[PDB]
Amino acid sequence: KITPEELERIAGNFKNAAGEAQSQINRLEGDINSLEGQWAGATQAKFRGEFIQSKQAMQQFIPILEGISTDLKRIADKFR
Amino acid sequence: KITPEELERIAGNFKNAAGEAQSQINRLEGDINSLEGQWAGATQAKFRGEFIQSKQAMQQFIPILEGISTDLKRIADKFRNTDNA
């Protein structure tokens, strides 16, 4: 019942979901980077909360992505 | 106590984790695409297990990735809102 054509469409949907995650990481890292020279005084206090949020999100999501990539790697490796 | 420098290192590790996932889906999709020309003449039953497994893997992770991307978007949006206030 499953055809490679169906799997192709699904793979594109995955590429898009992963790409959207990449986009938001890049956006967040850009925001963080924009503060590099400015982390002092009122700026520190202003963005402290966002920094706490960012650490907690990124640190927790790294291993989820690693599990995903490892799973796909194994599937691709064994794909006959 | 969190600094932009600490966050940058974490962010790079996260970019890499996401990039690696993109790399592996590209590998798998290349494998899938390469099967299309021979599909009509294949013993298709021999592919069923790996097709079911790969379909499950790809589909199941989509809402998880969407949850992650939405979560990050919300933080980036707050950044924008805070900065604009």
Closest residue of B to A35, CA-based? B4
Q: Give B-chain residues touching A28 at CB under 8 angstroms.
A: 11, 72, 75-76, 79
List the single residue in B with minimal CA-CA distance to A74.
B24
| Torsions phi, psi for B80 (to 5 deg) | -60, -50
Residue B10 and residue A41 in contact, taking contact as beta carbons nearer than 8 Å:
no
Whole-number Å distance between alpha carbons of A67 and A11: 17
Report in angstroms the alpha-carbon separations of A29 from A48, B59, B80, B83: 15, 28, 13, 15
Structural domains of chain A ordered from first start = 1-80 (1.10.287.850)
The resolution in angstroms reads 1.3
B55 lies within 8 A of chain A by CB:
yes
CB atoms within 10 A of CB B41: 7
First and final C-alpha spacing in chain A:
18
Q: Is A41 exposed, middle or buried (0-12, 13-18, 19+ CB in 10 A)?
A: exposed
Give the technique used to solve this structure.
X-ray
Q: Measure CA A19 to chain center.
A: 8
